[PDB]
Amino acid sequence: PAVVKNPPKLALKIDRADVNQLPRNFRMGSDKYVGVTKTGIMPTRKGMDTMNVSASSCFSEKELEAILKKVPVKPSQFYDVDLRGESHGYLNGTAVSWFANHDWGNDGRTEDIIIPLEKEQLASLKGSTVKSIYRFDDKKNVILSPVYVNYNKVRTEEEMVKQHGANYFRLTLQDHFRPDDPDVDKFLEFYKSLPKDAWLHYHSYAGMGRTTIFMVMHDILKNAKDVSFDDIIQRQKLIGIVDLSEIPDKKKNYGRKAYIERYQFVQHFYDYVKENPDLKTPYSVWAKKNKVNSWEPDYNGYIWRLDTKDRNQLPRNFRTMNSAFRTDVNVKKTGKGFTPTPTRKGLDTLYMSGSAEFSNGELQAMLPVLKQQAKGPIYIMDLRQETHGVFNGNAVSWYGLRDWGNLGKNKAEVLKDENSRLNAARGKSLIVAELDKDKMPIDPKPVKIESVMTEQQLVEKNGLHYYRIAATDHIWPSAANIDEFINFTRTMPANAWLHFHSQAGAGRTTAYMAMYDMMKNPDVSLGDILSRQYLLGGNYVAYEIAKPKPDQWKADYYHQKAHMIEKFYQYVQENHADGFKTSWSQWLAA
Amino acid sequence: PAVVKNPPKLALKIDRADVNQLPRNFRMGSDKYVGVTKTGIMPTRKGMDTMNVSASSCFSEKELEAILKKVPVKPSQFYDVDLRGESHGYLNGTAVSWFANHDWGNDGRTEDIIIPLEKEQLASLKGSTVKSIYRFDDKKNVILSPVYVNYNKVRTEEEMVKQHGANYFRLTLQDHFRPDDPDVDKFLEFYKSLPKDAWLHYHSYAGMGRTTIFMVMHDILKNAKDVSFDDIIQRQKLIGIVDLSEIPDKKKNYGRKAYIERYQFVQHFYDYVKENPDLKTPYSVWAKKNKVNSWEPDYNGYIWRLDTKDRNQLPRNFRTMNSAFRTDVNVKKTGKGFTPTPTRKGLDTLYMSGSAEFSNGELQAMLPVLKQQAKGPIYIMDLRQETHGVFNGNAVSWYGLRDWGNLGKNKAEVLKDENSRLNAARGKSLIVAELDKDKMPIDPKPVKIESVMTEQQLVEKNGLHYYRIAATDHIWPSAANIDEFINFTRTMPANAWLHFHSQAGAGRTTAYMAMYDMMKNPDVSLGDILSRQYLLGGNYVAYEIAKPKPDQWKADYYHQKAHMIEKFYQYVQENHADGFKTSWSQWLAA
C-alpha cells in the first residue's frame, strides 16, 4: 500500500489484521533472555518465573485466542490491562483505532470523556457492514491506503475480552508518555484487589513504551525487595524490546524529554515500592511529599466571587414558561433541531422558571412574580455543586479554577464544606470580587462581612421550599444527579412550581429545564423543547463548537451535552408512560 | 511583509531593528506591579527594590544604549546575561540570529560547539557589506520576506557589549526549556563571583520564558529566606509578562510537558536555596541527592574492551611515509581539497608512521619495519585519553559511552586512573570483549587476567621511547593537546621518528600526522597533505557529513575538525619560519 499524503486529522485505521498467531512483541515474564547487556553481564533472573505476567502489542481477536491458549491459566484468571488512551475497538476480529498524528487522537482528554467518546465512535459504525478503513505502517507510524473491511459486529475491547470469559482493566494513557500519578494510583488500587492467582497481560499499541513501563512496574511490585532497579530495567529489555534507561541520539528536544520523563518515573516508582512495601500510602501522596509528583491542576477554591450584587430587580436570565420569546436570537449559538417557531404546547401548565443566582434583593423581586403565576408550592432548585451563600445580602461563591471548587464531592461533603466556609467568613474582612472575562478579579478590595446566610436559610425565611442538587459547572449533569431530580419529581406535590438556578442560569439551569419540559411534554419534539427553552432565555443545550481551537477546553463537554440530551429524550420517549419506574442510571446501563 | 511558505531549514533573520528605545518586555526588579493576581491579593514587595536587576527581550545596539542609560550603575558594573543558545550576533547595530523551527537552530548542541559555531556563522558575513536577511513575526514566530541590510561591522553580542564598557556572560539555553543542571551550576559559580554592586540584566529572545526563569532564580537567591515561593512567582509575573505557575489550556502534549518541567524546576531551585543559603553544595549535587536532577549522560567506563588481539602481524591501519597509496579510494569519504594524485614531496624525510593500537605481537611485527626505515630515535606517540593497557598480550581499554571514559580529565588524572584500574584487574576474572557496530559486546565470557602492563611498559621494554597525549576520541585535538605536541617537537631530536597511534589509527592519529606533515612541509598545499595522509591509509581530516541525520552525533565534531585543520594550516604558514615560537593557543587567541 501507499502512504496517504493528506490524511484526515482523525483517521480510522487497522491496528491488527485478524490472524491466528501471537501478536507483536509478545513476551512472558518467564521468557529467556535474548541479546546482551552493555557490560556483557546478565542481570539476575530472581523472581521472574513467578510473576504470572505477559505483555504485547495490541491484538486481533485470533491473537487474543492465541494468548489465552498460551498462558497457563483459565480465562477466568486472565486480566487484560489495556493501556491505550487512543480510541479503539473491534470490527469482527479486526482491531481498529482512531489515529491522529503522534497517535494523540485523544490528546489531553480525561478517562470520563474518552470512554464514552470511544463507545460513540464505535457506535457510529453499527448499521453498516462494510467500510473503507485505512491501513497503517508500524515502522513509520503513518496512514496507508485503505482496504474494505466486512463485519457484522462492533465491539469495545472490553466486550470482546469478556466474551472470551476473561477480565478487563483500562487505563487511558497517552502514547509516548509515562502514566500520570492518578493513573498510577488507579492501577495500584486495582492491583491490590487482585486474586492471588491472577494473570496480568499488559498491552498498548506497539507493546513498546507504555507496555514496558508497566512490565517494569509489575517486576518492581513483585521483586523490588530482592532485585536492583538496574537489573529490572535490563531484564525487561532482554525479554522484550525496550530499555527504559536508553536515551538514544536520535531523540531530541521534546521526544528526548519524554524518554527522560518516563525513565525517571520508573526510578521514583521503584523507590516508592522500596519505601512502602505495604502500598499503604498512595503513590501520588508519597510522590508529592518527595517532590517527584507529576503535575495536576488544582481546582480548589481560592477566592470569594461576587456572583450577583444585592439589587432590587429580577435576577439575570430570569424567565417563566409564560414569558415572551427573546428577540436577540443568534442562530450560531443554537444547534441541531433549532427552530425559531417551536410549539408552546404545555408551557401554560409546566409551572417552571429559571435564572442566574440571586441576591436578597433579587429574590424579593422574584417573589411577587412567581406567586402571581404559581398554582401550588414553589421550590427553589439550587443546582450548584460549588460552595456558595450570601454575604451582606450579596450572592457569593467559593471560586476555584473552572468553578470546580467541589469537584468529586458528594452532596453531604458539599454542604459540609459550604456551611464551614460561610461560618468561617463571618465578621472577617475579605476580598469579594466580581470576575472578568479571564476569571481575574476586578478592582479587588477587602470588605467587611457583616451578615452571612446559606441560600437555603434565605429562601426558607421568605416562605419558599428549597432543594439542592450538586451539579458540576460546565458539564452534563451526572446520572446520579439526574436520578435525584427524577426521584424528586415523583414525590413532589401537585401543582408544584420549580424555579431552577445555577450560577448564570445558562448551562446547568437550561439543561434541567429542558429535561423537565421533556418529561412533562413527551409529545413535543427534541428540537422544539431545546428551541423554546433557548427562546425563553436559556442557552441551547445541544450547542457544539464548530471548529474547536486548542484553548477551547469546553468543546468536549458541549459535545457530551449535545449527545446526552438526545439520549435523555429517548429515555423519556420509552419510560414516561409508566411514570419513569425505570431510572435513568438503570436505563443507561442496559 | 509576507509569510515565507517554505523557509530554509536555517534562516538568518532580523531579531531587533536598530531603534533608540528600551527593548521589548523590559523591566526592572524594582518596577511597580501591573495587573492583579487571581486572589486579588498582592504579594509582598519585600526585597524587590535592592535586587539590582533588569530583564528584557534581545536588544539592538541602540536598545542596549537605552538600557545602559536607564539603569542606575556605570557600564563597568553592568552584566549582560545572554541566555540564548540559538546562534546570534550583530550587523552594525541590528541584532540578527539563525532561526530554525521552534527556534531550535542549535538543537542538542553543547556550549563548546555553539560558541565557535556562532563565531564561524558570523565570520561568514564579513566579506560583504550587504545581505538579504529574513524578517520575522514575533507573534507567530515565523520567517517573513527578506530585506537588504547594509553593514560594515559584524560582531558577537559579547563584542558589542564589551565595546560599550559592560560585562558579558553567556548560557546557551535552548528556547522553550528550563536550564539543565550543569548550566544552573555554571550560573551559580558566576553569580557567586560577582562584585556586590553588580547589576544583572537577563535576556533571551522574547524576554518571556528563559528570561522569567532567571528573574525568578535571582529573586530566589536574594529573597528565599524572607519571601515565599508563590509570592516570588506572582511578583515576577506582575512586573513582567509570564507566570511560570500557569499551564494554559492551549499548551498540550509536548509543549505542556515543557511548561510543567520548568515550573517544577523553579520549585526545586527554591528548595535548594532555602536548604543551602551558603550555596556551598552545588545545585546538581543537591538535585541528584534529592532525585530531582535533570538527566545527564554518563560517559564513565563500564567494560574492558578488547582493542586488538595479540597476533603476529602489523597493527591495523599501519603506514609509514614510505608506504604505498591505497587502492580502495572512496571519494565520498574525502572532502574539500581531495586529489587522488597529491605530491609526495617531503615524505622521504618525514620520519613518521601511524597505526591503530597494538598488542604485543603487533608491536613485535612493527619493530623491524620501523628500525629498517628510521634514521634516528623512535618515539611511540600514544594519543589516547581513554584508559588502556595490555592484558595477557592483548590491547584493551576501559570503555565508556562514546569512548569518553576520561572526558574532562587532565593528563595526571588519566594516568592515575589508568594505573589504578590496570593494577586492580591483575589476577581477576573479567569480561574482555570485542564490541560490535552498536558498541555491544560480542560473545562476552570472563577470562582470567594473568599479566598486566601499561603500553609505556610494553614499549620501553622493547627499547623504544614513549610519550602520551591524552586526546579525547572523536573530536579535534584540544588547544592544550596540540601545544603539548608542538612543545614536544621543539625539544626532540632532529631525526626523531614519530609513530602516532590511537584506538583505530584514524581520527586522532591522522589529524596529528597531518599537523606534523604540514609543520615539516609548509610548501605543500593543505589539500595535498590531507589527500596523501588519506591515501597512505588514514582518514580524511576535513571529512564532513553531507546530509546528517538525527542519529549522527559526530556531525558537528567532523565539521569542527574540517574547520580547525584549515586554521592549523594557516598557523603553520604564519609560524614555521621561526620554529613555532608563538604557540597554537596564543595564535588562536588573537
Ligand SMILES: O=P(O)(O)O[C@H]1[C@H](O)[C@@H](OP(=O)(O)O)[C@H](OP(=O)(O)O)[C@@H](OP(=O)(O)O)[C@H]1O
Ligand atoms: O525510524 P527509526 O530509526 O526506527 O527510529 C524512530 C525515528 O527516529 C522517529 O523519528 P522520525 O519521525 O524522524 O523518523 C522517532 O520519532 P520522533 O520523530 O517522534 O522522535 C521514533 O521514536 P519513538 O516514536 O519514540 O519510537 C524512533 O523510534
Ligand SMILES: O=P(O)(O)O[C@H]1[C@H](O)[C@@H](OP(=O)(O)O)[C@H](OP(=O)(O)O)[C@@H](OP(=O)(O)O)[C@H]1O
Ligand atoms: O452556571 P451555569 O448556569 O451552568 O452557566 C455557566 C456559568 O455561567 C459559567 O460561568 P463560570 O464559568 O464563571 O462559573 C459560564 O462560563 P463562562 O462565563 O466562562 O462562559 C458558562 O458558559 P459556557 O460554559 O460557555 O456555556 C455557563 O454555561
Ligand SMILES: O=P(O)(O)O[C@H]1[C@H](O)[C@@H](OP(=O)(O)O)[C@H](OP(=O)(O)O)[C@@H](OP(=O)(O)O)[C@H]1O
Ligand atoms: O497564539 P497564542 O494565543 O499567543 O498562543 C500560542 C499558541 O498556543 C502556540 O500554538 P500554535 O503553534 O498552535 O499557534 C503555542 O506554541 P506551541 O504550538 O508550541 O504550543 C505558543 O506557546 P509558546 O511558544 O510557549 O508561547 C502560545 O503562546
